[PDB]
Amino acid sequence: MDEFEMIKRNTSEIISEEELREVLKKDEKSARIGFEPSGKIHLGHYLQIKKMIDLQNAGFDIIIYLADLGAYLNQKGELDEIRKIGDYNKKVFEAMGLKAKYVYGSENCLDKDYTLNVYRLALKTTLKRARRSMELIAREDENPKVAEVIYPIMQVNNIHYSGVDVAVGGMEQRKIHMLARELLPKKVVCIHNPVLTGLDGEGKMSSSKGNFIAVDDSPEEIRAKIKKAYCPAGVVEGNPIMEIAKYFLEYPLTIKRPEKFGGDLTVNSYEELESLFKNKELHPMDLKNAVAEELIKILEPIRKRLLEH
Amino acid sequence: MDEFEMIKRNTSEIISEEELREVLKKDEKSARIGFEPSGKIHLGHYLQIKKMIDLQNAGFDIIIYLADLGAYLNQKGELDEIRKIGDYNKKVFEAMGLKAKYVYGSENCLDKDYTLNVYRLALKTTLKRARRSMELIAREDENPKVAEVIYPIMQVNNIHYSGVDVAVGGMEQRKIHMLARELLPKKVVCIHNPVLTGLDGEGKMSSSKGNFIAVDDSPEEIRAKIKKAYCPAGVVEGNPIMEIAKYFLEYPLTIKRPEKFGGDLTVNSYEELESLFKNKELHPMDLKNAVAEELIKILEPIRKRL
């Protein structure tokens, strides 16, 4: 259990590793992550929250950013509507066992030199690089708006203003984070978590399409969604059920099966679970049952906390 | 003579004339114009200011915008240097016989309400429309910056925040002003002034960084720049000297010439001066000396004021 590996565990990339090792040496360190306010907090958000918890236990002061302004620029709706959702998400995050500080994007507005820094950054940033950093973040519009290229420099400005040593986000945030390391006097260490495949087994676990498992979902909904979910026998890559079993489940894990399908089998890890699923020894249905029933137990402390305080 | 026609005099276009008349009926009326701080204030600025004074005499409260942030996004340097230049520009404008509300862009902006509205307008404006609006304004750059597309929506936000009825600027501001009529709840009346041809005839006046006549220029420089200026015989269109003679000179006028050229001759107006120039009765040399000396007398109280 090394703090470097405890942090690196279940991440896609760290830019860089040496710089992160340097940060760990400081007895005063902080990390930041930003979520656009979402009507449902699914396992996608929870995955990154878990990583923030790891950073916290590593001694990092955690700052959680509710990107209401960013969401507004990304056409998520009206500002105060997004703020209200941001409030709800704040409650949810405060119910996940995380000791963190919370900041709304519309709170930094206004610090005079902050909004001035937006124009400073806009002077260094090319339109092509801004658009390039927005491909995996913005659902496309016919004739893209100016607000699109304002989006990344606002996140870069938030990273700078937060004063964190580490910027955390999904793998779709790397181009924005690559901008931050190029536009800011201090180069932040970038920790990128993988992107969860949705239940429908195509895009990412996204904006409330029934492609998600919300952390406040009832056991009925969880069971029904996992059962319906995309899970081909022998397929691991892009398999959302296998991903959930990798990034959320606790091993060694006991899987329940009727004796006619072979008795109960208890895997000692995910890799063993992976080998058994590849070799068609473990069928999708049994995998779904175990995953669903475990998900209920994992999400129950969060579900009860929200219903209601 | 008339509030409407005095305003329209020496203007290129009004968007629209009908709305202008409606604004003229309002008990309180205000006009706005934005200037990027430049070290040299020339006849290009003066012409627009003369039009702001025209509006001032018609009941319009005048708001002069020292666009420090605009010039900053247009890569004219750092804010403090630009702001100092803005101070000097305020002095020049005041010395032009114009008492008005002088507002810096860095004053109203960098505020909660203003900044949020910038983002609102940014949500309304497409990237193509923004870049296209900056054709005749943006500093040439092989790698276009985001500052370029933020520029126009901040100008139209200054218009909304000013609450003015009339937006004033050159013809190069047209595309930006058209955005202001589409993005804002209040369709402002856009009054556009002609773009003065530069002295050498290789483009417009500003800056560039010759090709101009600063209002505070010494008589020596005035006489010298005019002498060297582009002035094709018989040609009026594109001739900066003829433009200056149309937009600045008082008429009736009298041009001093030796009698081996036709002697001194009286011109009742610019149009007679134009007919005499096209018909080659008046030569570029004599026309230059006339325009030069008259400009010296016109800009004299301004030059002395500084």
Coordinates of C-alpha atoms in Angstrom, one line a residue:
Chain A
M1 CA 0.0 0.0 0.0
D2 CA 2.1 2.8 -1.4
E3 CA 0.5 6.3 -1.6
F4 CA 1.8 6.6 -5.2
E5 CA 0.2 3.3 -6.2
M6 CA -2.9 3.9 -4.1
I7 CA -3.4 7.0 -6.2
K8 CA -2.3 5.5 -9.5
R9 CA -4.6 2.5 -9.0
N10 CA -7.4 2.3 -11.6
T11 CA -6.3 5.4 -13.6
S12 CA -5.7 5.7 -17.3
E13 CA -2.6 8.0 -17.1
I14 CA -0.7 10.3 -14.8
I15 CA 1.1 13.3 -16.3
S16 CA 3.5 13.0 -15.0
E17 CA 4.6 10.3 -12.5
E18 CA 7.8 12.0 -11.4
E19 CA 6.0 15.3 -10.9
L20 CA 3.4 13.5 -8.8
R21 CA 6.2 12.0 -6.7
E22 CA 7.5 15.5 -6.1
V23 CA 4.1 16.7 -5.0
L24 CA 3.7 13.9 -2.5
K25 CA 6.8 15.2 -0.7
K26 CA 5.0 18.4 0.2
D27 CA 3.2 18.3 3.6
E28 CA 0.7 20.8 2.1
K29 CA -1.0 19.7 -1.1
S30 CA -4.3 19.9 -2.8
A31 CA -6.3 18.4 -5.7
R32 CA -9.2 19.6 -7.9
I33 CA -12.0 18.1 -10.0
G34 CA -15.0 19.6 -11.7
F35 CA -18.3 18.1 -12.6
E36 CA -20.9 19.9 -14.7
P37 CA -24.1 19.7 -12.6
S38 CA -26.0 16.5 -13.6
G39 CA -29.6 15.5 -12.9
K40 CA -28.4 12.1 -11.9
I41 CA -25.1 11.2 -10.2
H42 CA -24.1 7.8 -11.7
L43 CA -21.1 5.5 -11.3
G44 CA -19.2 7.7 -13.6
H45 CA -19.1 10.5 -11.1
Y46 CA -18.7 8.0 -8.2
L47 CA -15.6 6.5 -9.9
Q48 CA -13.8 9.8 -9.8
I49 CA -15.1 10.6 -6.3
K50 CA -13.5 7.4 -5.2
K51 CA -10.2 8.6 -6.7
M52 CA -10.5 11.9 -4.9
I53 CA -11.0 10.0 -1.7
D54 CA -7.7 8.1 -2.4
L55 CA -6.0 11.5 -2.9
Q56 CA -7.5 12.8 0.3
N57 CA -6.2 9.8 2.3
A58 CA -2.8 10.5 0.6
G59 CA -2.9 13.9 2.3
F60 CA -4.4 16.0 -0.4
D61 CA -6.9 18.8 0.5
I62 CA -9.8 18.1 -1.9
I63 CA -11.6 20.8 -3.8
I64 CA -14.7 19.8 -5.6
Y65 CA -15.8 22.1 -8.4
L66 CA -19.5 22.5 -9.4
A67 CA -19.1 23.7 -12.9
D68 CA -22.4 25.5 -13.2
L69 CA -21.0 28.2 -15.5
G70 CA -19.2 25.7 -17.6
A71 CA -22.4 23.7 -18.0
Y72 CA -24.1 26.9 -18.9
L73 CA -21.5 27.4 -21.6
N74 CA -22.0 23.8 -22.7
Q75 CA -25.7 24.5 -23.2
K76 CA -27.0 22.5 -20.2
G77 CA -29.8 25.0 -19.6
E78 CA -30.5 28.2 -17.5
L79 CA -27.9 29.3 -15.0
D80 CA -30.0 29.1 -11.8
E81 CA -31.5 25.8 -12.9
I82 CA -28.0 24.4 -13.3
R83 CA -27.2 25.9 -9.9
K84 CA -30.1 24.1 -8.3
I85 CA -28.9 20.8 -9.8
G86 CA -25.4 21.8 -8.6
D87 CA -26.9 22.1 -5.1
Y88 CA -28.3 18.6 -5.3
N89 CA -25.0 17.2 -6.6
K90 CA -23.3 18.9 -3.7
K91 CA -25.6 16.9 -1.3
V92 CA -24.9 13.7 -3.1
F93 CA -21.1 14.2 -3.1
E94 CA -21.4 15.1 0.6
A95 CA -23.0 11.6 1.1
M96 CA -20.1 9.6 -0.4
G97 CA -17.7 9.7 2.5
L98 CA -15.6 12.5 1.1
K99 CA -14.2 15.4 3.2
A100 CA -13.9 18.2 0.6
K101 CA -14.3 21.9 -0.1
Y102 CA -17.0 22.9 -2.6
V103 CA -16.8 25.8 -5.1
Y104 CA -19.4 27.0 -7.7
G105 CA -18.0 28.3 -11.0
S106 CA -20.2 31.4 -10.5
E107 CA -18.4 32.2 -7.2
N108 CA -15.1 33.1 -8.8
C109 CA -17.3 35.5 -10.8
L110 CA -16.4 38.0 -9.7
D111 CA -12.8 38.3 -8.8
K112 CA -11.7 41.2 -11.0
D113 CA -8.4 39.6 -12.0
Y114 CA -10.1 36.2 -12.5
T115 CA -12.4 37.4 -15.3
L116 CA -9.4 39.4 -16.5
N117 CA -7.4 36.2 -16.5
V118 CA -10.1 34.8 -18.8
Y119 CA -9.1 37.4 -21.4
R120 CA -5.4 36.9 -20.6
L121 CA -5.8 33.2 -21.4
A122 CA -7.9 34.0 -24.4
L123 CA -4.9 35.9 -25.7
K124 CA -2.6 32.9 -25.5
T125 CA -5.1 30.3 -26.7
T126 CA -5.7 29.6 -30.4
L127 CA -9.3 28.9 -31.6
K128 CA -8.1 25.6 -33.2
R129 CA -6.6 24.3 -30.0
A130 CA -9.7 25.3 -28.0
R131 CA -12.0 23.6 -30.5
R132 CA -9.7 20.6 -30.5
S133 CA -9.9 20.3 -26.7
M134 CA -13.7 20.3 -26.9
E135 CA -14.4 17.4 -29.2
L136 CA -15.1 14.8 -26.5
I137 CA -17.0 17.2 -24.2
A138 CA -19.6 19.1 -26.3
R139 CA -22.5 17.4 -28.1
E140 CA -22.2 18.9 -31.5
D141 CA -24.2 21.9 -32.7
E142 CA -24.9 22.9 -36.3
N143 CA -22.7 26.0 -36.5
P144 CA -20.7 25.9 -33.2
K145 CA -21.1 28.9 -30.9
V146 CA -18.4 31.2 -29.4
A147 CA -19.3 29.9 -25.9
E148 CA -17.6 26.6 -26.9
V149 CA -14.1 28.1 -27.0
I150 CA -14.7 30.0 -23.8
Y151 CA -15.4 26.7 -22.0
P152 CA -11.8 25.3 -21.9
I153 CA -10.1 28.5 -20.9
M154 CA -12.6 28.9 -18.0
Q155 CA -11.6 25.4 -16.7
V156 CA -8.0 26.4 -17.1
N157 CA -8.7 29.6 -15.2
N158 CA -10.4 27.6 -12.4
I159 CA -7.4 25.2 -12.1
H160 CA -5.1 28.2 -11.8
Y161 CA -7.4 30.0 -9.3
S162 CA -7.8 26.9 -7.1
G163 CA -4.1 26.7 -6.6
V164 CA -4.0 22.9 -6.6
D165 CA -1.0 20.8 -7.4
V166 CA -3.1 18.1 -9.1
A167 CA -5.9 18.3 -11.6
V168 CA -8.2 15.3 -11.8
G169 CA -10.8 14.4 -14.4
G170 CA -11.9 11.9 -17.0
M171 CA -9.8 10.8 -20.0
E172 CA -11.8 13.3 -22.1
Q173 CA -10.3 16.1 -20.0
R174 CA -6.7 15.5 -21.1
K175 CA -6.7 18.1 -23.9
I176 CA -8.1 20.7 -21.6
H177 CA -5.5 19.7 -18.9
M178 CA -2.8 19.7 -21.6
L179 CA -3.8 23.3 -22.2
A180 CA -3.5 24.1 -18.5
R181 CA 0.0 22.8 -18.3
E182 CA 0.8 25.1 -21.2
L183 CA -1.0 28.2 -20.1
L184 CA -0.3 28.3 -16.4
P185 CA 2.9 29.3 -14.5
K186 CA 2.7 26.2 -12.4
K187 CA 2.3 22.8 -14.1
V188 CA -0.3 20.7 -12.3
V189 CA 0.0 16.9 -12.2
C190 CA -2.9 15.5 -14.3
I191 CA -4.6 12.3 -13.1
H192 CA -7.0 10.9 -15.7
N193 CA -9.6 8.3 -14.7
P194 CA -11.0 5.9 -17.4
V195 CA -14.4 6.5 -19.0
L196 CA -17.2 4.1 -18.0
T197 CA -19.0 2.5 -20.9
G198 CA -22.8 3.0 -20.6
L199 CA -25.3 0.2 -19.9
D200 CA -26.5 0.3 -23.5
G201 CA -23.0 -0.7 -24.4
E202 CA -22.1 2.0 -26.9
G203 CA -21.3 5.5 -25.7
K204 CA -20.1 6.5 -22.3
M205 CA -22.3 6.4 -19.1
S206 CA -24.0 9.7 -19.9
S207 CA -26.8 12.1 -19.2
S208 CA -29.8 10.1 -17.8
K209 CA -30.7 8.0 -20.8
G210 CA -31.3 4.8 -18.9
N211 CA -27.7 4.1 -19.7
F212 CA -26.6 4.6 -16.1
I213 CA -26.7 3.4 -12.5
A214 CA -27.4 6.4 -10.3
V215 CA -26.0 6.1 -6.7
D216 CA -29.5 6.9 -5.4
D217 CA -31.2 4.3 -7.6
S218 CA -33.5 1.9 -5.8
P219 CA -32.7 -1.9 -5.8
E220 CA -35.5 -2.5 -8.3
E221 CA -34.1 -0.1 -10.8
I222 CA -30.6 -1.3 -10.2
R223 CA -31.6 -4.9 -10.8
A224 CA -33.7 -4.1 -13.9
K225 CA -31.0 -2.0 -15.4
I226 CA -28.2 -4.5 -14.8
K227 CA -30.3 -7.3 -16.2
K228 CA -31.2 -5.4 -19.3
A229 CA -27.6 -4.1 -19.7
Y230 CA -25.2 -5.0 -22.5
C231 CA -23.1 -8.0 -21.6
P232 CA -22.0 -10.4 -24.3
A233 CA -20.5 -13.7 -23.2
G234 CA -16.7 -13.7 -23.5
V235 CA -16.5 -10.0 -24.1
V236 CA -14.6 -7.9 -21.6
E237 CA -13.5 -4.8 -23.5
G238 CA -16.4 -2.3 -23.7
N239 CA -18.4 -4.5 -21.3
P240 CA -20.0 -2.2 -18.8
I241 CA -20.8 -5.0 -16.3
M242 CA -17.2 -6.1 -16.3
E243 CA -16.0 -2.5 -15.8
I244 CA -18.3 -2.1 -12.8
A245 CA -17.0 -5.3 -11.4
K246 CA -13.5 -3.9 -11.9
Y247 CA -13.8 -0.4 -10.5
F248 CA -16.4 -0.9 -7.7
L249 CA -16.6 -4.4 -6.5
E250 CA -14.6 -5.8 -3.5
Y251 CA -12.6 -9.0 -3.8
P252 CA -12.5 -11.9 -3.0
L253 CA -16.1 -12.0 -4.2
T254 CA -18.6 -14.8 -3.9
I255 CA -20.9 -15.4 -6.9
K256 CA -24.2 -17.2 -6.3
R257 CA -25.3 -19.9 -8.8
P258 CA -27.8 -22.8 -8.6
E259 CA -26.0 -26.1 -8.3
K260 CA -27.3 -27.2 -11.7
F261 CA -25.1 -24.4 -13.3
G262 CA -22.3 -25.5 -11.1
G263 CA -22.1 -24.5 -7.4
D264 CA -21.2 -21.1 -5.9
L265 CA -17.8 -19.9 -7.2
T266 CA -15.7 -17.4 -5.3
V267 CA -13.2 -15.4 -7.3
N268 CA -10.2 -13.9 -5.4
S269 CA -9.9 -11.0 -7.8
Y270 CA -11.2 -9.3 -11.0
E271 CA -8.5 -10.9 -13.2
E272 CA -9.8 -14.3 -12.2
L273 CA -13.3 -13.1 -12.8
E274 CA -12.1 -11.9 -16.2
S275 CA -10.5 -15.3 -17.0
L276 CA -13.6 -17.1 -16.0
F277 CA -15.8 -14.8 -18.1
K278 CA -13.6 -15.1 -21.1
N279 CA -13.6 -18.9 -21.1
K280 CA -17.4 -18.9 -20.9
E281 CA -17.3 -20.5 -17.5
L282 CA -19.3 -17.7 -16.0
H283 CA -22.4 -16.7 -17.9
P284 CA -23.6 -13.1 -18.2
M285 CA -26.8 -13.6 -16.2
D286 CA -24.9 -14.8 -13.1
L287 CA -22.4 -12.0 -13.5
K288 CA -25.3 -9.5 -13.7
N289 CA -26.9 -10.9 -10.5
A290 CA -23.7 -10.7 -8.5
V291 CA -22.8 -7.3 -9.8
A292 CA -26.4 -5.9 -9.1
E293 CA -26.6 -7.4 -5.6
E294 CA -23.2 -6.0 -4.7
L295 CA -24.0 -2.6 -6.2
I296 CA -27.0 -2.4 -3.9
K297 CA -24.9 -3.0 -0.8
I298 CA -22.2 -0.5 -2.0
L299 CA -24.7 2.2 -2.8
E300 CA -27.0 1.7 0.1
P301 CA -25.2 4.0 2.6
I302 CA -25.4 6.7 0.0
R303 CA -29.0 6.0 -1.0
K304 CA -30.3 6.1 2.6
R305 CA -28.3 9.3 3.4
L306 CA -30.0 11.1 0.6
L307 CA -33.5 9.8 1.4
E308 CA -33.7 11.9 3.3
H309 CA -31.7 14.5 5.4
Chain B
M1 CA -31.0 73.2 -40.0
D2 CA -32.8 70.1 -38.7
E3 CA -31.9 67.5 -36.2
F4 CA -32.1 64.5 -38.6
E5 CA -30.2 66.0 -41.5
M6 CA -27.4 67.5 -39.4
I7 CA -26.7 64.0 -38.1
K8 CA -26.9 62.4 -41.5
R9 CA -24.4 64.9 -43.0
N10 CA -21.2 63.2 -44.1
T11 CA -22.4 59.8 -43.0
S12 CA -22.3 56.6 -45.0
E13 CA -25.4 54.9 -43.8
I14 CA -28.0 54.9 -41.0
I15 CA -29.7 51.7 -39.7
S16 CA -32.2 52.9 -39.8
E17 CA -33.3 56.4 -40.6
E18 CA -36.8 55.8 -39.5
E19 CA -35.7 54.5 -36.1
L20 CA -33.4 57.5 -35.8
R21 CA -36.4 59.8 -36.1
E22 CA -38.2 57.8 -33.4
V23 CA -35.2 58.1 -31.2
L24 CA -35.1 61.9 -31.9
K25 CA -38.6 62.1 -30.5
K26 CA -37.6 60.5 -27.1
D27 CA -37.1 63.0 -24.3
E28 CA -33.8 61.4 -23.3
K29 CA -31.4 60.1 -26.0
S30 CA -27.8 58.9 -25.8
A31 CA -25.2 57.9 -28.4
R32 CA -22.1 55.7 -28.0
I33 CA -18.8 55.2 -29.7
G34 CA -15.8 53.0 -28.9
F35 CA -12.2 53.9 -29.5
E36 CA -9.2 51.6 -29.2
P37 CA -6.4 53.6 -27.5
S38 CA -3.8 54.7 -30.1
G39 CA -0.8 56.9 -29.6
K40 CA -1.8 59.0 -32.6
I41 CA -5.2 60.7 -32.9
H42 CA -5.7 61.6 -36.5
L43 CA -8.4 62.9 -38.8
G44 CA -10.1 59.6 -38.8
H45 CA -10.9 60.0 -35.1
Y46 CA -11.7 63.7 -35.6
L47 CA -14.4 63.0 -38.2
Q48 CA -16.2 60.6 -35.9
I49 CA -15.9 63.0 -33.0
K50 CA -17.3 65.8 -35.1
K51 CA -20.3 63.5 -35.7
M52 CA -20.5 62.9 -31.9
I53 CA -20.7 66.7 -31.5
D54 CA -23.4 66.8 -34.1
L55 CA -25.3 64.3 -32.0
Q56 CA -24.5 66.4 -28.9
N57 CA -26.3 69.4 -30.4
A58 CA -29.4 67.3 -31.1
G59 CA -30.1 66.4 -27.4
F60 CA -28.0 63.2 -27.3
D61 CA -26.0 62.5 -24.2
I62 CA -22.6 61.4 -25.4
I63 CA -20.7 58.4 -24.1
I64 CA -17.1 57.9 -25.2
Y65 CA -15.8 54.4 -24.7
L66 CA -12.1 54.1 -24.2
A67 CA -11.9 50.5 -25.3
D68 CA -8.9 49.4 -23.2
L69 CA -9.9 45.8 -23.0
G70 CA -10.8 45.7 -26.7
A71 CA -7.4 46.9 -27.7
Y72 CA -5.9 44.4 -25.2
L73 CA -7.7 41.5 -26.8
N74 CA -6.6 42.9 -30.2
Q75 CA -2.9 42.6 -29.1
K76 CA -2.1 46.3 -28.6
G77 CA 0.0 45.6 -25.5
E78 CA -0.6 45.4 -21.8
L79 CA -3.5 47.1 -20.0
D80 CA -1.6 49.7 -18.1
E81 CA 0.2 51.2 -21.1
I82 CA -3.0 51.1 -23.2
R83 CA -4.9 52.8 -20.3
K84 CA -2.3 55.6 -20.2
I85 CA -2.8 56.1 -23.9
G86 CA -6.5 56.1 -23.1
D87 CA -5.9 59.0 -20.7
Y88 CA -4.1 61.0 -23.5
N89 CA -7.0 60.1 -25.9
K90 CA -9.5 61.5 -23.4
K91 CA -7.5 64.7 -23.3
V92 CA -7.5 64.9 -27.1
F93 CA -11.2 64.2 -27.4
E94 CA -11.9 66.9 -24.7
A95 CA -9.7 69.3 -26.6
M96 CA -11.7 68.6 -29.8
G97 CA -14.6 70.5 -28.2
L98 CA -16.4 67.5 -26.8
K99 CA -17.6 67.3 -23.2
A100 CA -18.9 63.8 -22.5
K101 CA -19.1 60.7 -20.3
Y102 CA -15.7 59.0 -20.7
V103 CA -15.8 55.3 -19.7
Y104 CA -13.0 52.7 -19.7
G105 CA -13.8 49.2 -20.8
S106 CA -12.0 47.9 -17.7
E107 CA -14.4 49.9 -15.5
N108 CA -17.8 48.4 -16.3
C109 CA -16.4 45.0 -17.3
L110 CA -14.7 42.7 -14.8
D111 CA -18.0 42.7 -13.0
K112 CA -20.5 39.9 -12.2
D113 CA -23.4 41.1 -14.3
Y114 CA -21.4 42.1 -17.3
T115 CA -19.2 39.0 -17.4
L116 CA -22.3 36.7 -17.1
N117 CA -23.9 38.5 -20.0
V118 CA -20.7 38.1 -22.1
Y119 CA -21.2 34.3 -21.7
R120 CA -24.9 34.7 -22.6
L121 CA -24.0 36.5 -25.8
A122 CA -21.2 34.0 -26.5
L123 CA -23.9 31.3 -26.3
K124 CA -25.9 33.2 -28.9
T125 CA -23.0 34.0 -31.3
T126 CA -21.5 31.4 -33.7
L127 CA -17.7 31.1 -34.2
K128 CA -18.1 31.8 -37.9
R129 CA -20.2 34.9 -37.4
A130 CA -17.7 36.2 -34.8
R131 CA -14.5 35.7 -36.9
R132 CA -16.3 37.1 -40.0
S133 CA -17.2 40.3 -38.0
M134 CA -13.5 40.8 -37.2
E135 CA -12.3 41.0 -40.9
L136 CA -11.7 44.7 -41.0
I137 CA -10.8 45.1 -37.3
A138 CA -8.6 42.2 -36.0
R139 CA -4.9 42.3 -36.0
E140 CA -3.4 40.0 -38.6
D141 CA -2.4 36.6 -37.0
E142 CA -1.5 33.4 -38.8
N143 CA -2.8 31.5 -35.7
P144 CA -6.2 33.1 -34.7
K145 CA -6.7 33.5 -31.0
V146 CA -9.9 33.1 -28.9
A147 CA -9.4 36.8 -28.0
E148 CA -10.5 37.6 -31.5
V149 CA -14.0 36.1 -31.2
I150 CA -14.4 37.4 -27.6
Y151 CA -13.8 41.0 -28.9
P152 CA -17.0 41.6 -30.8
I153 CA -19.4 40.2 -28.2
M154 CA -17.8 42.4 -25.6
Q155 CA -18.4 45.5 -27.7
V156 CA -22.1 44.6 -28.2
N157 CA -22.2 44.0 -24.4
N158 CA -20.8 47.5 -23.9
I159 CA -23.6 48.8 -26.1
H160 CA -26.3 47.0 -24.1
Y161 CA -24.7 48.0 -20.8
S162 CA -24.5 51.6 -21.9
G163 CA -28.3 51.6 -22.6
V164 CA -27.7 54.0 -25.5
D165 CA -30.1 54.3 -28.4
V166 CA -27.4 55.1 -31.0
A167 CA -24.2 53.2 -31.8
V168 CA -21.6 55.2 -33.8
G169 CA -18.5 53.9 -35.6
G170 CA -16.8 53.6 -39.0
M171 CA -17.9 51.3 -41.8
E172 CA -15.6 48.6 -40.5
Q173 CA -17.8 48.4 -37.4
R174 CA -20.8 47.5 -39.5
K175 CA -20.7 43.7 -39.1
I176 CA -20.2 44.0 -35.3
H177 CA -23.1 46.5 -35.1
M178 CA -25.4 44.1 -37.0
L179 CA -24.7 41.5 -34.3
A180 CA -25.8 44.1 -31.7
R181 CA -29.1 44.5 -33.5
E182 CA -29.7 40.7 -33.3
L183 CA -28.2 39.8 -29.9
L184 CA -29.7 42.6 -27.8
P185 CA -33.3 43.2 -26.7
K186 CA -32.9 46.8 -27.7
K187 CA -32.3 47.4 -31.4
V188 CA -29.8 50.3 -31.4
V189 CA -29.7 52.8 -34.2
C190 CA -26.4 52.3 -36.0
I191 CA -24.8 55.4 -37.6
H192 CA -21.7 54.8 -39.7
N193 CA -19.0 57.3 -40.7
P194 CA -16.9 57.0 -43.9
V195 CA -13.4 55.4 -43.7
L196 CA -10.8 58.0 -44.6
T197 CA -8.2 57.0 -47.2
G198 CA -4.7 57.2 -46.0
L199 CA -2.2 59.9 -47.2
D200 CA -0.1 57.6 -49.3
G201 CA -3.1 55.8 -50.8
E202 CA -2.0 52.4 -49.6
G203 CA -5.0 51.8 -47.3
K204 CA -7.0 53.6 -44.6
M205 CA -5.8 56.3 -42.3
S206 CA -5.3 54.4 -39.0
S207 CA -2.6 54.1 -38.2
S208 CA -0.6 53.1 -40.2
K209 CA 1.8 54.1 -38.7
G210 CA 2.5 56.8 -41.2
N211 CA -0.2 57.7 -43.8
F212 CA -1.9 60.0 -41.3
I213 CA -2.4 63.5 -40.0
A214 CA -2.5 63.7 -36.2
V215 CA -4.7 66.5 -34.9
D216 CA -1.7 67.8 -32.7
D217 CA 0.8 67.5 -35.6
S218 CA 3.1 70.6 -36.1
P219 CA 2.4 72.8 -39.1
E220 CA 5.7 71.6 -40.5
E221 CA 4.7 68.0 -40.5
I222 CA 1.2 68.9 -41.8
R223 CA 2.7 70.8 -44.8
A224 CA 5.3 68.1 -45.4
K225 CA 2.9 65.1 -45.2
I226 CA 0.4 66.9 -47.5
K227 CA 3.1 67.8 -50.0
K228 CA 4.2 64.1 -50.3
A229 CA 0.7 62.8 -50.2
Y230 CA -1.0 60.8 -52.9
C231 CA -3.0 63.2 -55.0
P232 CA -3.7 62.1 -58.6
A233 CA -4.7 64.9 -61.0
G234 CA -8.4 64.8 -61.9
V235 CA -9.1 61.8 -59.7
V236 CA -11.4 62.4 -56.7
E237 CA -12.3 58.9 -55.6
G238 CA -9.5 57.5 -53.4
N239 CA -7.8 60.9 -53.1
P240 CA -7.3 61.5 -49.4
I241 CA -6.6 65.3 -50.0
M242 CA -10.1 65.6 -51.6
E243 CA -11.6 63.7 -48.7
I244 CA -10.0 66.0 -46.2
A245 CA -11.2 69.0 -48.2
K246 CA -14.8 67.6 -48.1
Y247 CA -15.0 66.6 -44.4
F248 CA -13.0 69.3 -42.6
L249 CA -12.7 72.5 -44.6
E250 CA -14.9 75.6 -44.2
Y251 CA -16.6 77.1 -47.3
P252 CA -16.6 79.5 -49.1
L253 CA -12.8 79.1 -49.4
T254 CA -10.1 81.0 -51.3
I255 CA -7.0 79.2 -52.7
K256 CA -3.8 81.3 -52.9
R257 CA -2.0 80.9 -56.3
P258 CA 0.4 82.9 -58.4
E259 CA -1.2 84.5 -61.5
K260 CA 0.8 82.2 -63.9
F261 CA -1.5 79.4 -62.8
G262 CA -4.8 81.3 -62.7
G263 CA -4.2 83.4 -59.6
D264 CA -6.3 83.2 -56.5
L265 CA -9.7 81.6 -56.9
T266 CA -12.8 81.4 -54.7
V267 CA -14.6 78.1 -54.2
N268 CA -18.1 78.4 -52.8
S269 CA -18.1 74.8 -51.7
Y270 CA -16.3 71.4 -51.9
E271 CA -18.4 70.6 -55.0
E272 CA -17.0 73.5 -57.0
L273 CA -13.6 72.5 -55.7
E274 CA -14.4 69.0 -57.0
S275 CA -15.6 70.2 -60.4
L276 CA -12.4 72.3 -60.7
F277 CA -10.2 69.4 -59.7
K278 CA -11.8 67.0 -62.2
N279 CA -11.6 69.5 -65.0
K280 CA -7.9 70.1 -64.1
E281 CA -8.3 73.8 -63.6
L282 CA -6.9 73.3 -60.2
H283 CA -3.6 71.4 -59.8
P284 CA -2.6 69.0 -57.0
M285 CA 0.2 71.3 -55.9
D286 CA -2.0 74.3 -55.2
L287 CA -4.8 72.1 -53.8
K288 CA -2.2 70.6 -51.4
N289 CA -1.0 74.0 -50.2
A290 CA -4.6 75.1 -49.6
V291 CA -5.6 72.0 -47.8
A292 CA -2.4 72.1 -45.7
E293 CA -2.7 75.7 -44.5
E294 CA -6.5 75.4 -43.8
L295 CA -5.9 72.3 -41.8
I296 CA -3.2 74.2 -39.8
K297 CA -5.8 76.8 -38.9
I298 CA -8.6 74.3 -38.1
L299 CA -6.5 72.0 -35.9
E300 CA -4.7 75.0 -34.3
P301 CA -6.8 75.4 -31.1
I302 CA -6.7 71.6 -30.6
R303 CA -2.9 71.5 -31.0
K304 CA -2.6 74.4 -28.6
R305 CA -4.9 72.7 -26.1
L306 CA -2.3 69.9 -25.9

